[PDB]
TrEMBL record, chains C, D:
Zn(2+) 4 binds at residues 138, 181. InterPro entries: PHP_domain (IPR052018), Pol/His_phosphatase_N (IPR003141), Pol/histidinol_Pase-like (IPR016195). This is Polymerase/histidinol phosphatase N-terminal domain-containing protein. Zn(2+) 3 binds at residues 93, 102. Zn(2+) 2 binds at residues 16, 41, 183.
Length: 222, 224, 221, 221
């Protein structure tokens, strides 16, 4: 148990990030991040239909391609560790823009339908032994999770107290479990709030530490 | 699918080449090149203003003359085919000398402002269904923007120049990026250069597809 | 004449490669290589005796076993053709580590002492009607220091090897080939030579020597 | 003519300094500096666009905002005088990172494109009747590589910057000034210029240009 520097909320050009996967990994690696999770979007049916219909980019990984996406991430787990000694964790951002809940899942193994109820999503993810975080809308951007915090008090392993360069006081004031991430899309988003966690350097230990949340701090990388 | 001999980076006296268009086409046709793209320069506004100000030649096609430039090439397409059985593809070299990136567009139809960000230029070229090559500065050459940032631009370009004139650029191959090899022609003697050999049907859409896929692409050194 | 995919520089565990002859053939065959030459090391006497005395593996074919080595390749020509329609060509890497010149010969028929001067080796190989290639050290050297001297000596020079290109051959406009210099499985993916040639050994050698219809091609996973 | 304490090279957070204009004025004013020039960066287009695209801070005044920048300095001239009897002079650091020349102009009135050759920049600034200083990189370069070339070009060269002296200006007997190149609070203590001059802007510029009554002075805590 030393303190690890972590970012659990990062996107690539596979969903709506600006950057190649390899680049993202290199950028976090060379900035000395110890743990990164790639969390590209999967998106509710209705939103995907709407986008197809308007000729917009999907900015999501489709259900058909989800396993290929994970395969891209497993291969990067190897290179991340070898080149940087960094733990890369395959994840996903479950993105329901119809009812407005974004859920970040870390150490995901199967696709989960973003159109499912919050609680059913979280149970499906806990059946995969995934860490489950309530993502906070970034400042640049009424959100269901955040409007119904008490309802979801024992639902999430952690809530985003910080995102990009912003702190959200509601999580701390309630004394809820917390993490802080970049919500990375653009090169300059590597400089953000991050999570510092006291943990053995392995994925089960890390998920356990965030879940306990007693040795978790937030840290502004500048 | 026979393998075709191709040169996607060729300049004429319409921009900063030494020779007239007709003569450039004849020279490549008589040397048995199967596919040539004419990629004369369009340059960022600031570079133009600076040449205009210094009274030095523009060395580029202006935005106002771009359609006239395409019109000359379309007519050259006819002659290239009739006289040599050669496929001439209208193209352009998008030349930002302020920020140091040169992007070759093959099968271009509309002018694109060289001043824009890389990804904006490329998105614009994709809407036109053009093939988008990251040009390498020639060895007679500064730190060049695309080449300093290759991992960032890995999913941006259909191919990178692995070779140019008589030089090879091992960085392209080492990283296993999609590659092309061109003359970057300006002068008679640049006809003898690295070229691209591609397995493809002898039509423009088929050729661009083959280059993008990049699994049946070789490089070939044309010598006297 | 179609364009053939070729690799003229390939090793087995009969010298210092990782893999058996049969397996090297299956690998290249299954990956669509049209022409391969097996070029296991014969070594200068100093190097060989340095290895004997330190109990190191020889990593080479001895003069005594060279005929048995070519006999194995003669037999593999049959299997390579019948199973893959691939042309296997017996060759050798004449390897001098004392004077630092490695010379690949394709379509070899007799042992040539690697300790002999470059010109005598090459004259010997030409008497066998072998194709003679200046090999380039892999990224991880007498010929390359004296290229002008050896301009008319070799039929072709290695412009590419494993994943690396060597600008010096291209710049000088020398005749070129590109090979894997294969020792282990993943080396199968490498720069290769594409050559426009009738698919027979004399034609292939002629086409490399002429070098007017030879390109280089990077085979990727 | 009394001897005036001067600093002709000073930055605020309007470019890449740490501190607001008002605060930079209060600091220098309270420390008895008689003459200060605010010389925030204007930057060559490559550098600026490199910053835009990487999402880095511009650390410069844009051509569009340059007039608003001089307007702020025109207004601060009043406060600097009324509060401290200090002469504030609008200036700029013309900053070319592509060709590596930084040129400080004191008493500037119009934007000059930093991407223009050194002689054209300087001719432009002289048309404005600005004072033109070759800035020296701070300890932590085209002009300094080509000093003979630029002997009659500049009114003065930086012989001192922050806590460092640069023997090359002195040895060649060039005209000299010494400045803080201030970005942060503690840079207020630095080498400064002492100049014998009537306390008005034309007189000060003349005295630096003549350079016969100019010394260098190290302000310490
Ligand atoms: Cl979010
Ligand atoms: Cl988002
Ligand atoms: Cl682990
Ligand atoms: Cl170029
Ligand atoms: Cl050019
Ligand atoms: Cl066509
Ligand atoms: Cl070798
Ligand atoms: Cl070897
Ligand atoms: Cl400076
Ligand atoms: Cl500075
Ligand atoms: Zn997103
Ligand atoms: Zn979101
Ligand atoms: Zn967001
Ligand atoms: Zn997000
Ligand atoms: Zn040109
Ligand atoms: Zn160019
Ligand atoms: Zn060029
Ligand atoms: Zn060019
Ligand atoms: Zn070997
Ligand atoms: Zn060797
Ligand atoms: Zn080797
Ligand atoms: Zn070898
Ligand atoms: Zn500064
Ligand atoms: Zn400076
Ligand atoms: Zn400085
Ligand atoms: Zn400065």
């Amino acid at each position: 148990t030393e303190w690890l520097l972590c970012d659990f909320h990062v996107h690539t050009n596979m969903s709506d990030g600006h950057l190649p996967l390899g680049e993202v990994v290199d950028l976090f690696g060379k900035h000395g991040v110890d743990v990164v999770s790639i969390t590209d979007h999967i998106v509710d049916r209705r939103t995907l239909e709407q986008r197809k219909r308007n000729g917009e980019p999907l900015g999501a990984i489709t259900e058909d391609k989800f396993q290929d996406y994970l395969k891209r991430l497993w291969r990067e787990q190897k290179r991340a560790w070898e080149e940087y000694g960094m733990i890369l964790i395959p994840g996903v951002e479950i993105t329901n823009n119809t009812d407005l809940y974004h859920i970040v899942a870390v150490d995901v193994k199967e696709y989960v339908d973003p159109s499912l109820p919050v609680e059913e999503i979280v149970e499906k993810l806990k059946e995969q032994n995934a860490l489950v975080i309530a993502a906070h809308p970034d400042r640049k951007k009424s959100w269901y999770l955040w409007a119904n915090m008490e309802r979801f008090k024992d639902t999430f392993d952690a809530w985003e107290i910080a995102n990009r360069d912003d702190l959200f006081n509601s999580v701390g004031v309630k004394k809820y479990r917390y993490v802080a991430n970049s919500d990375f899309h653009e090169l300059w988003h590597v400089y953000s709030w991050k999570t510092l966690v006291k943990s053995e350097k392995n994925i089960e230990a890390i998920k356990e530490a965030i879940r306990k949340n007693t040795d978790v701090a937030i840290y502004l990388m500048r």
